[PDB]
Ligand binder design. Sequence first.
Ligand SMILES: [Co+2]
Ligand SMILES: [Co+2]
Lengths: 471, 471
Amino acid sequence: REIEVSEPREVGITELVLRDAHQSLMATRMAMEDMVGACADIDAAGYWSVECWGGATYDSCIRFLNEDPWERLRTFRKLMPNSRLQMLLRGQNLLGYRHYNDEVVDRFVDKSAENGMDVFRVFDAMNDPRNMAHAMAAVKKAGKHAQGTICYTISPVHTVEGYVKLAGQLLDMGADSIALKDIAALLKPQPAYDIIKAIKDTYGQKTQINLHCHSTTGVTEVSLMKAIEAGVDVVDTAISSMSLGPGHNPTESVAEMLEGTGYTTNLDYDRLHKIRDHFKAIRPKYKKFESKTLVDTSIFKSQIPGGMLSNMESQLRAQGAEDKMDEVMAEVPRVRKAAGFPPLVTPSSQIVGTQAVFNVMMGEYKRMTGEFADIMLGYYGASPADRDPKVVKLAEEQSGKKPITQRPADLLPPEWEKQSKEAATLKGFNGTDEDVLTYALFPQVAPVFFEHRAEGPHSVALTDAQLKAEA
Amino acid sequence: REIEVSEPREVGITELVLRDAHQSLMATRMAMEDMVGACADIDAAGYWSVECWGGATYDSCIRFLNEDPWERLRTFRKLMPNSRLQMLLRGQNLLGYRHYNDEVVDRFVDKSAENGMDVFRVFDAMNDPRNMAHAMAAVKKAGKHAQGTICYTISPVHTVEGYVKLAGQLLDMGADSIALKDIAALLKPQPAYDIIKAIKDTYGQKTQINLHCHSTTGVTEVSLMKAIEAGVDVVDTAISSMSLGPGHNPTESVAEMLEGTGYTTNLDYDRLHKIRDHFKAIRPKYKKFESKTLVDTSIFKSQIPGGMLSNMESQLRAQGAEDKMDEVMAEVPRVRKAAGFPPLVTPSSQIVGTQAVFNVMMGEYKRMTGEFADIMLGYYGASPADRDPKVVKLAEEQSGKKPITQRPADLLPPEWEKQSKEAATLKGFNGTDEDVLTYALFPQVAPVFFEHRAEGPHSVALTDAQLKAEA
Ligand SMILES: [Co+2]
Ligand SMILES: [Co+2]
């Protein structure tokens, strides 16, 4: 047999240690003083982009580190002046708990670019191209790199056709590149290869594509090799001393494997070696936050992310009937289908999970949560497939809400001023739109943070004194 | 571009959890009671072979577990009756500290087969086909599967040509299959592919080849994918809950990645799931023996295995001048070349290491160890390349020994009876050739073990009581 592979070329690499790595391995608890020491080396490493913001870091900065995310960004911008900063943004949900009016989005993106962010990976938990439409436009306006995301998953209705169709929409709404986000490491080799190849084949070699695979299942570094053969443009990795497990593949490993393949990743190996040693010395101080598993191929059978899994397990233990776990494992599939097969990521995974528990407890949809009902009624957006009209009807009947199918942000009122007004009454507020955004995104935290921020950022990691006095 | 790949087929898998996995991750300290519970499942998993003996397990059984290796084998043979048992045997060195007369070898192999071993992976630390010649013959005589090994490494004189030449010798001395042993995870993708393809191309598709890659560097699972494309016959893996790090790639991961590639590994996924959960519950009791690194691509620059590295680091600290480490790192290359570029594995790595320290300390070869001199004089066998005649001369001059170049076992006297005689005087001896072999292999331990063996095997792992009282 013959396998057509892409021509010899440089592959781009995106380092994730400053954001997704620690968010995935140590609950986003990584402190800023523990990171800044590797910025210079990271800046000189030779990465295509450096993901250092977005995701749960915004929340973890104000909720657990008494740190100002905007200060973290302004510092990274200053310490890595030659690098393309990158961040994760959940579209019309920004980094918040709900959707927001376009005003908010415009201001957020506006302030993010103004403070130095270069690449914005905009994504949506249900893959609704509409919820990414505005953010994408806000980034293009700001003259920044827009990156439309596709949340990869395995389901009866997800196919290469379906992902190419999605790639066309991301592009049509003016995406400067397409990012394939595989957070559960469900992206197998052949599929990774075909999907990448199909996109490039349909829209053209010029179509820029970035592959973001985690290594929870342990098969994605091979997918990264295939992806590169299909001709992918960039692949995300994490410095070896902060990889594997629910983390990602190792940068040095991924750069080393290419030797002699005709492909190459122009990265300074010595720079990388310094970065590795850096976090290798810091990582033990975060053991109270490490996950205890390195490989888990279970989701290939269950389709249930381990995180989601336990989140229900303990959810059942609280009712002692936590022995029906086996029944729940069988209910999820059925609940997901009812919801139109949405990727199982936050919040779809936690929503679908809980609802699956109620069903295995109080009968099939005899009771639904506010969220589940809102997902069935379409207040989060359109599902990859059609939702069980039966259940949709029931939702509207149980809650009392109106079933909608248009961008959930269309029927949202201007809320900026209102946010500004309320934020200008919290002790500690500084008057910037930044502090306003923090209140609009985290209304429950903004108060306590604004009052303590003057104390300076802290850390919840063990001190070198504690590592000692223990081991 | 086009890449020729092998036709669709089943790939064989060899589980290593019962031997190499725990030897690599927890210093061979795994206890037998902690393992037997997974034997039934492992037997029904569907593996090509199950490595459950050889390596340092023979030593660790008598030196730390007060267990009889032959009893361990007879039990595995009994608990996994449908499986092909496999073991690692360092040729004319068997599992001992020195070479032995052919008698010993014949008796050892004879007793190993008699007790149930089916596949013998015979290998040699310097790749001298002669030191494997007799063992290989002993296995064929015993009607068992002989597996000639090639220790893969990266050096100025190691090439695909060189490995094919070696493959021809292994075959010529009647090898039923060729095993490519990469213990430092130096086997990159393209090389793994070319080497496998070359062998198959030269000697034929029928030539059976088994790939044994560790994952210390983090690039070998990709090599395993390529190897399979080049048409490899079997690949070694370790149950996911006992993988990565200085360990190996995960069995479930490796079996899962093939989906849709036209290749497949007929393994019972549920059986595998039980095996995984088994060792996942047992593995924490061995934390006092776990390695603290998961990925390390340093040997690609240094060519110095991390194990060898630290083994010198601490070797220098004992002299306070442990700051010349940088000079040692530069000396090794030079010492290896002098020795003819031997793979850096036990004992070549520890020998070459020490000698490299003396050089960086007492001047270039101003003093040599007994071993280094014996390696230069050829008492371990022939090197992959020629040894610096300069240094060879110096060796013979420093020690006083005669320089030889023929199989070091040719000039060895019959020693069985002598061993039997001496072993029949140790309290606890049972009179079997087995107990005699133990004395011949471990003369320093056989005494203490024979006196305590009646106490039954023990464990040096934390007790479920200790895990608790700690965490
Ligand atoms: Co991620
Ligand atoms: Co091994």
